[PDB]
Amino acid sequence: EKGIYQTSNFRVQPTESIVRFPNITNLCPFGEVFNATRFASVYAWNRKRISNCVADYSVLYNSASFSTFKCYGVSPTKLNDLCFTNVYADSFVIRGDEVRQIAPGQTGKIADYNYKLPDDFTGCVIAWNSNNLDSKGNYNYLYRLFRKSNLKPFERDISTEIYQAGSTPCNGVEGFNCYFPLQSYGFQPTNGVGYQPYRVVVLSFELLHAPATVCGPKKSTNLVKNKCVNFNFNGLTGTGVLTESNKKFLPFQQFGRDIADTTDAVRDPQTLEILDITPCSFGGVSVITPGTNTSNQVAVLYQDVNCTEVPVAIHADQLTPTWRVYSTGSNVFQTRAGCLIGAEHVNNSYECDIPIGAGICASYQTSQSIIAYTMSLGAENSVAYSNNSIAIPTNFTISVTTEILPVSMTKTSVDCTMYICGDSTEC
Amino acid sequence: GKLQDVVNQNAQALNTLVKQLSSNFGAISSVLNDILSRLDPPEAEVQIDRLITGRLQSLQTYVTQQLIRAAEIRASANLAATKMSECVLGQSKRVDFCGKGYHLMSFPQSAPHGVVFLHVTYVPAQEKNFTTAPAICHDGKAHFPRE
Amino acid sequence: AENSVAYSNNSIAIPTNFTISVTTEILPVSMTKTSVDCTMYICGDSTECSNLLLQYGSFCTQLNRALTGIAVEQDKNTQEVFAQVKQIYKTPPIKDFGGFNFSQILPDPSKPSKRSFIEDLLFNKVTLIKQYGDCLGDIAARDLICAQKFNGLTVLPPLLTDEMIAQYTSALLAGTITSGWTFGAGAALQIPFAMQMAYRFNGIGVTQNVLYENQKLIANQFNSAIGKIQDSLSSTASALGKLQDVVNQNAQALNTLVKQLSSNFGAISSVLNDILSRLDPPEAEVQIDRLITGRLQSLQTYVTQQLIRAAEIRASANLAATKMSECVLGQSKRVDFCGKGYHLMSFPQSAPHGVVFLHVTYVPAQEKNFTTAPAICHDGKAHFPRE
Amino acid sequence: AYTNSFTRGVYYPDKVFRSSVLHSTQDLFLPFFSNVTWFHAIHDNPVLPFNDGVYFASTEKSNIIRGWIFGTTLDSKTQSLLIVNNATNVVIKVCEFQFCNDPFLGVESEFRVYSSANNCTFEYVSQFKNLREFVFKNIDGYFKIYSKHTPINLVRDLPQGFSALEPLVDLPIGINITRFQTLLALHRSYLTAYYVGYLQPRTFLLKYNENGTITDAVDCALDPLSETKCTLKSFTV
Ligand SMILES: *[C@@H]1O[C@H](CO)[C@@H](O[C@@H]2O[C@H](CO)[C@@H](O)[C@H](O)[C@H]2NC(C)=O)[C@H](O)[C@H]1NC(C)=O
Ligand SMILES: *[C@@H]1O[C@H](CO)[C@@H](O[C@@H]2O[C@H](CO)[C@@H](O)[C@H](O)[C@H]2NC(C)=O)[C@H](O)[C@H]1NC(C)=O
Numbered sequence A: 001e002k003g004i005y006q007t008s009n010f011r012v013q014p015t016e017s018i019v020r021f022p023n024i025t026n027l028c029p030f031g032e033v034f035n036a037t038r039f040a041s042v043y044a045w046n047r048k049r050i051s052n053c054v055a056d057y058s059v060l061y062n063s064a065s066f067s068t069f070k071c072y073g074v075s076p077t078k079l080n081d082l083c084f085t086n087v088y089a090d091s092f093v094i095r096g097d098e099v100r101q102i103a104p105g106q107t108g109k110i111a112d113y114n115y116k117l118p119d120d121f122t123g124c125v126i127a128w129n130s131n132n133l134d135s136k137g138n139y140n141y142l143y144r145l146f147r148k149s150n151l152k153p154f155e156r157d158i159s160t161e162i163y164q165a166g167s168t169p170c171n172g173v174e175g176f177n178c179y180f181p182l183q184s185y186g187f188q189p190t191n192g193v194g195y196q197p198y199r200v201v202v203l204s205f206e207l208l209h210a211p212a213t214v215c216g217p218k219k220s221t222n223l224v225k226n227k228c229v230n231f232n233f234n235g236l237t238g239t240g241v242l243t244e245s246n247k248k249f250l251p252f253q254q255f256g257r258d259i260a261d262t263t264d265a266v267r268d269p270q271t272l273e274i275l276d277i278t279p280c281s282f283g284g285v286s287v288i289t290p291g292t293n294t295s296n297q298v299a300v301l302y303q304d305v306n307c308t309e310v311p312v313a314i315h316a317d318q319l320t321p322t323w324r325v326y327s328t329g330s331n332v333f334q335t336r337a338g339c340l341i342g343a344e345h346v347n348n349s350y351e352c353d354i355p356i357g358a359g360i361c362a363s364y365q366t367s368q369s370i371i372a373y374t375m376s377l378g379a380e381n382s383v384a385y386s387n388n389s390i391a392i393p394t395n396f397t398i399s400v401t402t403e404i405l406p407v408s409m410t411k412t413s414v415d416c417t418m419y420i421c422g423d424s425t426e427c
Numbered sequence B: 001g002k003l004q005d006v007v008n009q010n011a012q013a014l015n016t017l018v019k020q021l022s023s024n025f026g027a028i029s030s031v032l033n034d035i036l037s038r039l040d041p042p043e044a045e046v047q048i049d050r051l052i053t054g055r056l057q058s059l060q061t062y063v064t065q066q067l068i069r070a071a072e073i074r075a076s077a078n079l080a081a082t083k084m085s086e087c088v089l090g091q092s093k094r095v096d097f098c099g100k101g102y103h104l105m106s107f108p109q110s111a112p113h114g115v116v117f118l119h120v121t122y123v124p125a126q127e128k129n130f131t132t133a134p135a136i137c138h139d140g141k142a143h144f145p146r147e
Numbered sequence C: 001a002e003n004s005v006a007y008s009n010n011s012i013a014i015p016t017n018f019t020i021s022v023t024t025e026i027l028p029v030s031m032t033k034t035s036v037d038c039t040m041y042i043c044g045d046s047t048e049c050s051n052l053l054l055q056y057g058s059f060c061t062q063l064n065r066a067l068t069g070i071a072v073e074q075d076k077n078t079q080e081v082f083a084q085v086k087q088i089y090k091t092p093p094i095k096d097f098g099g100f101n102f103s104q105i106l107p108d109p110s111k112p113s114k115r116s117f118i119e120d121l122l123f124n125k126v127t128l129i130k131q132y133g134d135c136l137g138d139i140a141a142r143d144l145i146c147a148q149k150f151n152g153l154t155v156l157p158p159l160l161t162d163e164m165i166a167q168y169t170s171a172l173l174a175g176t177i178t179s180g181w182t183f184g185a186g187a188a189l190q191i192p193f194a195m196q197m198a199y200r201f202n203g204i205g206v207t208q209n210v211l212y213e214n215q216k217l218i219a220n221q222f223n224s225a226i227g228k229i230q231d232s233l234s235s236t237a238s239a240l241g242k243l244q245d246v247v248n249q250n251a252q253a254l255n256t257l258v259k260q261l262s263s264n265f266g267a268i269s270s271v272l273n274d275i276l277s278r279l280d281p282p283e284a285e286v287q288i289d290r291l292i293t294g295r296l297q298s299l300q301t302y303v304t305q306q307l308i309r310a311a312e313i314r315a316s317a318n319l320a321a322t323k324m325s326e327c328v329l330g331q332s333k334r335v336d337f338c339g340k341g342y343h344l345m346s347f348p349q350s351a352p353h354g355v356v357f358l359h360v361t362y363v364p365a366q367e368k369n370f371t372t373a374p375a376i377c378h379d380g381k382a383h384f385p386r387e
Numbered sequence D: 001a002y003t004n005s006f007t008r009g010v011y012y013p014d015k016v017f018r019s020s021v022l023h024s025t026q027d028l029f030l031p032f033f034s035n036v037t038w039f040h041a042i043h044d045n046p047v048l049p050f051n052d053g054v055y056f057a058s059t060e061k062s063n064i065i066r067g068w069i070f071g072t073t074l075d076s077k078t079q080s081l082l083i084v085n086n087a088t089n090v091v092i093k094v095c096e097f098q099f100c101n102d103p104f105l106g107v108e109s110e111f112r113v114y115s116s117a118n119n120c121t122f123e124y125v126s127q128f129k130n131l132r133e134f135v136f137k138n139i140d141g142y143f144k145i146y147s148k149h150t151p152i153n154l155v156r157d158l159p160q161g162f163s164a165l166e167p168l169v170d171l172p173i174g175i176n177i178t179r180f181q182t183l184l185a186l187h188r189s190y191l192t193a194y195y196v197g198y199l200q201p202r203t204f205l206l207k208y209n210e211n212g213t214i215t216d217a218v219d220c221a222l223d224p225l226s227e228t229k230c231t232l233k234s235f236t237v
């Protein structure tokens, strides 16, 4: 039907992809972590720092020995695209049937006395069978059996004191219901599965907040300003336009946020300049039609857009050629409601037909085309006021007019259980 | 058109409510019978709770918009009852309340979901210029017209 | 204040003077027209999110239909208050009007605008396009309005400009001052202004010789009351509180809707790009559905409260249209409907989103005690007063 | 002895740049107008608790204050922590020390702090007009440290304005802390000026300026007026 319709939105599309990783070329020492002759016992677990490297993660999970590759705040497919902060690695040996205790929220004497993970853990847990390397006899793999209380997350308790399991205070030497707290492991090569030793590595990191030194194999591109790009800064993706900023970041800061918690500023990782981020231009599109009874011609309003910026405001020559005629031409008119394209501006005033806004209306007139004009308020008139003149009527008209008012509406009812559940008694 | 609008808005609201039943709202199906044919109750509960939550939200939206439309229809019916009292059962002096011109009388006619008033007024027609004065002096005294 | 009437069964008090009084009434007419791009609010530019949003049905078609219905009604409100006559009556030259001075409410005739002096004072007292256009200098473009536009929230302009609304009000003023109430009923019939004022005195039950004998005093009292309105609007703070409240409530609702985008609603992040950077789609879908459900709830709350505010604004504009018809285009007998006292005449002035009425009334002033009687007996017959 | 904080121990709670907004944060903070314990050397170091975290401030002119020990028993049965300045570099160390019953440092002179230092798991090395402020926290196997230095304008009392502490270092030590003791630089080596406040779980309302600087705050549990300002999310009522 004849009218004006908000139908969709235009939006400039990005052209190319940008990657800006830091410039680091030395690889990352995972051989020193995963191929070591002697791992540590679980009560005294080792923590190794990992820093200033390029770490390729796919050769870990695309290998054979690991019977556990459990990641927690992240997917394994994504690990080669992110940059990491405060990377640490933790290594020990446990029994074969308590790998399930190395997880957030676990009970058991390993999780309660020896090595505790937090609830909001971010990282990966890797485990594999080491029967060939740690079984013969072997007894210097100890675990803790007795503590006064439960451990905190990432707490290590390396201390020797005789465990008072009675009401009498012992000292120094073993006694009755007084116990040495540590206990060895019986790793024999003919043990069943569940008693055979397993080697465990725990990686833990932080993602996308602070500056980063450890990240995977991506090749950078060059920084492209002043146009709608598809960026990737240290693993943080998004679409927008990059321009130079003049905010000053303190050296522990990599990103800025606005009131809606979106990223709107970034420090480059090769240059150390500050850039601003802003989405590529969009807006509403209204279509002015007469009836499809009468025509198939239309005019198009781009709401709150300047007219010389409309092919900048749309993604210029990506649209259909049937579409791109409605971004240029000679029927281009600037109003305060945006840019109108496809109607001829005339200089008369008429009573309003299809409202556009800020004083402008549109119509279909005689061949036939769509016109745009300023609406008229009414007919000009002037009263012949004087200080001793009056006008008196000498005839009259009897007039009858109609007035229509709504009184009532349709009464409806809803059977709720039939709407929600049908006939189903389970529902 | 004012009476056709009330018919159209309510048919549109009921048709929207009927075709909201083909959304799955994040479940595996929007058809409850297809969910109950393929799964047993312990993991069927998870999908049926999603469908229940979505359809409950649809019904609540329909009812809230009906209550706001009923309040506007109530104000329109109060105004029509006042016009019946003051234009059909009396002669009114309120400017423009019973048509344009000076009100003589009004007639009511019934209409579907509504009411139509026929207002009869006096409109002055063919005017002449004259010279006028506020008062007239006759014997050293001022005279003023009565009506 | 405590007071006590000296009632008796044969005493009456009659006034011996009067005061010409001018008072102000302010009414809201329209509110800001807004629009929402739903997919840009909920999903940003993520096509994964916008494909998941199709599972919830026609919710955003429904929300945009409700907001479009509000925006059309806001132009109907303004047409109903201001466009009641279809002749544009031209401002006469102001040198007669029997001593009554209308210069501060009529449009300034050397300036090319149509605003009067009091309309200029009213338009400088409410603290309310191309700031969507700039939004890229990216340090000075940290306004609240660029944060709204980047998440799909826009403001639509009104159909009538402020200059058009001032033209309508000056045509109503010219019709009233040159013709009385005749242009509201038909063609305008000219009458001199002191004869118009005499017939309005006659309408409140005072004989017209009272007007003609006190003409200069009545015109001086009127000109003084107009000056008091003008300097009270040049020296106050919050006379237009009813119009400032509509602006404040609208800006508050849009800012609340923008700040709701930093809730995670039980997900691991409130930023969609962080979720898409760290997870693959089978377990990303679980977090994105939580964010979709929270943001849909926020939009539905905003739209429900806009519809309720639009119904109250509509009742206020119906009352302003009735007051234009019954106090500017006629003389009213309804007690207190056009000010306090006996109504003589009213003048309209446009205001941002609103209308101001200046009501002129007769207030009795200086009373005396007399002895009274119901009838008088002369020749064995009772005599009663006519008027 | 006691003094008054007025505004002490507000730090940047995260690492993201924010300009010209307000922001509400739950952390461990030092409450406003609380009593800080005073220690002076008019001419003493006991074992103060830790409990949830510590505000530490200190003021001298010529490098007397140097480092702390943190632990549980201080008796070589459990692990413990040590931080010392050399006036060139800083030494941080998580061995299983047997500590002396009165640790200090003789004036260059030798160390009279620990006799035995076995069983080490961590080691690190790094680099009145001086008020040095510190916040220590021990959460999730980490030891966080915030700091800032300013020229004190006064004689003995703490200054009145507002200044926020930047983050310094985060240490993965994995130990249990319940007590601590500061380490001085004593001239006459006898093997036998600083303020301490405790951190509380609060809610604060932080104001960031045009340049990204925290210039003002509101402690929401201080008084009813500030409890009003935290509900209204502004600074004027
Ligand atoms: C951290 O160390 C403290 C200090 O010893 C431990 O808390 C003590 O536990 C005993 C157990 O009977 C209590 O009697 C003491 O009162 C506690 N002292 C304090 C200061 O709280 C605590 O158990 C250790 N942490 C963990 C997780 O074991
Ligand atoms: C007042 O107006 C009416 C029009 O309604 C005039 O009536 C017309 O008079 C002429 C001359 O006699 C006739 O030819 C027309 O047919 C009449 N019209 C109608 C509708 O009856 C009437 O003459 C006018 N009166 C004056 C004094 O001018």
Ligand SMILES: *[C@@H]1O[C@H](CO)[C@@H](O[C@@H]2O[C@H](CO)[C@@H](O)[C@H](O)[C@H]2NC(C)=O)[C@H](O)[C@H]1NC(C)=O
Pocket: C016, C017, C018, C217, C220, C221, C366
């Ligand atoms: C009625 O009230 C008016 C007040 O408006 C009186 O007018 C005043 O008269 C005195 C004496 O002539 C003058 O000095 C004042 O300047 C007048 N005031 C104004 C505003 O003009 C008038 O006298 C009163 N009439 C009666 C009969 O009491």
Ligand SMILES: *[C@@H]1O[C@H](CO)[C@@H](O[C@@H]2O[C@H](CO)[C@@H](O)[C@H](O)[C@H]2NC(C)=O)[C@H](O)[C@H]1NC(C)=O
Pocket: C101, C102, C103, C104
């Ligand atoms: C009608 O009232 C206006 C008040 O605004 C008078 O205009 C002022 O006249 C004084 C001289 O007495 C000038 O100093 C002002 O600049 C004028 N103001 C404006 C806005 O022009 C005006 O003179 C009065 N008209 C008559 C006929 O007395």
Ligand SMILES: *[C@@H]1O[C@H](CO)[C@@H](O)[C@H](O)[C@H]1NC(C)=O
Pocket: A030, A031, A032, A034, A035
């Ligand atoms: C550990 O050694 C195995 C066998 O030689 C090898 O496949 C693997 O890549 C090594 N791990 C590293 C280098 O991280």
Ligand SMILES: *[C@@H]1O[C@H](CO)[C@@H](O)[C@H](O)[C@H]1NC(C)=O
Pocket: A023, A269, A270, A271, A272
């Ligand atoms: C490498 O990084 C340094 C330090 O950030 C920077 O100065 C230099 O320009 C970078 N070089 C390249 C080729 O990116």
Ligand SMILES: *[C@@H]1O[C@H](CO)[C@@H](O)[C@H](O)[C@H]1NC(C)=O
Pocket: A292, A293, A294
């Ligand atoms: C369109 O217009 C034609 C011509 O008036 C009419 O015959 C036809 O019924 C119309 N169709 C609709 C759907 O209005």
Ligand SMILES: *[C@@H]1O[C@H](CO)[C@@H](O)[C@H](O)[C@H]1NC(C)=O
Pocket: A306, A307, A308, A334, C130
């Ligand atoms: C569009 O841009 C031109 C060039 O700066 C400017 O002159 C014009 O005023 C702009 N249009 C609007 C509506 O601001």
Ligand SMILES: *[C@@H]1O[C@H](CO)[C@@H](O)[C@H](O)[C@H]1NC(C)=O
Pocket: A345, A346, A347
């Ligand atoms: C309308 O008039 C202006 C001058 O007032 C002129 O510049 C313009 O071209 C005219 N447009 C048409 C369609 O006549």
Ligand SMILES: *[C@@H]1O[C@H](CO)[C@@H](O)[C@H](O)[C@H]1NC(C)=O
Pocket: A384, A391, B127, B128, B129
């Ligand atoms: C009255 O006189 C004026 C001035 O000559 C004229 O313009 C006007 O039309 C006259 N009115 C009528 C009703 O003839």
Ligand SMILES: *[C@@H]1O[C@H](CO)[C@@H](O)[C@H](O)[C@H]1NC(C)=O
Pocket: C006, C013, C367, C368, C369
């Ligand atoms: C009328 O008389 C009463 C009683 O003496 C007195 O109180 C009252 O004020 C008088 N009214 C006037 C208007 O003087």
Ligand SMILES: *[C@@H]1O[C@H](CO)[C@@H](O)[C@H](O)[C@H]1NC(C)=O
Pocket: D002, D034, D035
């Ligand atoms: C802090 O010191 C003041 C000194 O006036 C004292 O009244 C108050 O009780 C002290 N507060 C605490 C918690 O000890």
Ligand SMILES: *[C@@H]1O[C@H](CO)[C@@H](O)[C@H](O)[C@H]1NC(C)=O
Pocket: D086, D088, D089, D090, D091, D125
């Ligand atoms: C600081 O002094 C201690 C003790 O002499 C020493 O162990 C440490 O290496 C020194 N730090 C340096 C030289 O950076």
Ligand SMILES: *[C@@H]1O[C@H](CO)[C@@H](O)[C@H](O)[C@H]1NC(C)=O
Pocket: D076, D096, D118, D119
């Ligand atoms: C540290 O470990 C050794 C064995 O490497 C052990 O003999 C010693 O007792 C431990 N230190 C302490 C203080 O217990």
Ligand SMILES: *[C@@H]1O[C@H](CO)[C@@H](O)[C@H](O)[C@H]1NC(C)=O
Pocket: D209, D210, D211
């Ligand atoms: C913000 O930083 C600028 C430096 O460009 C400085 O001139 C200005 O004083 C600072 N603003 C405030 C409020 O301190």
